[PDB]
């Protein structure tokens, strides 16, 4: 049925949803007592993607 | 061909072999892939934070869930001992282990609490769990100095927990993937 057939389209994205939440959870709760930000992802993350998205870090400090 | 014990003689008898093949798309669809999409989540908890209060949860979660699907399977098969459905082996080794994931995460969650107030850490874990793992599983520490006693070896406790978390992260994808295919592998090859 088409309608179980987009009911486990859907499942299929939740777990990727779900994966991909415990990998934001992970970075979220990181701090220099425990990790180094490379250049990179200092980089990327917060200046490339940002002006992508249209987010603009208000970066007051 | 045969002879009877309540018969002297020979009772002929045609016997007809009814070979069939299950169309399997059905059961595919209902069980398999749900209960694969539920494997994939069965080592996510040793990459959750002990900081987000979520670890519970999730392994709690998939735990019942695992359990629910046996219990359908269960429904479908005779009760027979002869033989048993390799869906209902992965399914029951997948619980045992999702069983023994949360209580490495109940002890993780434990050892992330711990401060100077109520428990002394002991120099052979300080040694181990801060220098020699961590370098093993290639997670460096950053150098930092903090001055408060308390407040660092707080973070000292959070480390620990965090390297032993990715032990159990290797490990637990170590044995998922090598047990899915020395399960189900073989059976495919022939």
């Known amino acids: ?61 | 061909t045969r002879k009877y014990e309540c018969c002297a003689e020979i009772y002929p008898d045609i016997t007809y072999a009814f070979v069939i093949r299950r169309l399997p798309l059905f059961y595919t669809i209902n069980l398999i892939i749900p209960c694969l999409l539920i494997s994939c989540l069965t080592v996510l908890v040793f990459y959750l934070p002990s900081e987000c209060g979520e670890k519970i949860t999730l392994c709690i979660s998939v735990l019942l869930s695992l359990t629910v699907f046996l219990l359908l399977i269960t429904e479908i098969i005779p009760s027979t001992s002869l033989v048993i459905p390799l869906i209902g082996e992965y399914l029951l080794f997948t619980m045992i282990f999702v069983t023994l994931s949360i209580v490495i995460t109940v002890f993780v969650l434990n050892v992330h609490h711990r401060s100077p107030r109520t428990h002394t850490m002991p120099t052979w874990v300080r040694r181990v769990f801060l220098d020699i793992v961590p370098r093993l599983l290639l997670m460096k520490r950053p150098s930092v100095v903090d001055t408060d006693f308390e407040r660092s070896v707080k973070e000292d406790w959070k480390y620990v927990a965090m390297v032993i978390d990715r032990i159990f992260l290797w490990m637990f994808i170590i044995v998922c993937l090598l047990g899915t295919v020395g399960l189900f592998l073989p059976p495919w090859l022939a």
Request: hydrophobic share 50%; charged share 10%.
């Open chain 1, 1 to 61: 049925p088409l309608v179980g057939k987009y009911l486990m389209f859907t499942m299929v994205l939740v777990t990727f949803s779900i994966v991909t939440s415990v990998c934001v959870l992970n970075v979220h709760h990181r701090s220099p007592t425990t990790h180094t930000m490379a250049p990179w992802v200092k980089v990327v993350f917060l200046e490339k993607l940002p002006a992508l998205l249209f987010m603009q870090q208000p970066r007051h400090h």
